[PDB]
């Protein structure tokens, strides 16, 4: 009962090739700089932050060099996962979590993907 984790509450929409930012915050708001904060696929680790820095060695391959965790507001308990070069396999559910020692809470976030160039390279 220390805190709950809340997402945007509605799907984030992105076009193929765009960057997409998925937000998550702890409530009540408090400093999350010292917590483990992660994102996984709804499990496959999309991005993980712990001990003050992104843990590159702990994320999956389909996301290496393709993610960022925006931490400008982490001192207020807010973060956003930025996925670069969105593609259809990125569509769907994500789980964001915040862990403070033995306590962990999470939220579900959805990404919807539209291909603005759906008409290219037909017939093969």
Swiss-Prot record:
Taxonomy, superkingdom: Eukaryota
Keywords, in A-Z order: Cell adhesion, Disulfide bond, Glycoprotein, Immunoglobulin domain, Membrane, Signal, Transmembrane, Transmembrane helix
Keyword Nucleus: no
GO molecular function: signaling receptor binding
Segments forming a coiled coil: none
Gene Ontology cellular-component annotations: cell surface; external side of plasma membrane
UniProt domain Ig-like: residue ranges: 3-110
Residue ranges annotated as Extracellular topological domain: 1-123
GO BP terms: cell adhesion; regulation of cytokine production; response to folic acid; response to lipid; T cell receptor signaling pathway
Membrane topology: Multi-pass membrane protein
Tissue: Found exclusively in the CNS, where it is localized on the surface of myelin and oligodendrocyte cytoplasmic membranes.
UniProt function note: Mediates homophilic cell-cell adhesion. Minor component of the myelin sheath. May be involved in completion and/or maintenance of the myelin sheath and in cell-cell communication.
Subunit structure: Homodimer.
Family statement drawn from the similarity comment of this UniProt entry: Belongs to the immunoglobulin superfamily. BTN/MOG family.
Protein name: Myelin-oligodendrocyte glycoprotein
Source species: Rattus norvegicus
Classification of source organism: Eukaryota, Metazoa, Chordata, Craniata, Vertebrata
Residues of the full protein shown: 28 to 152 of 245
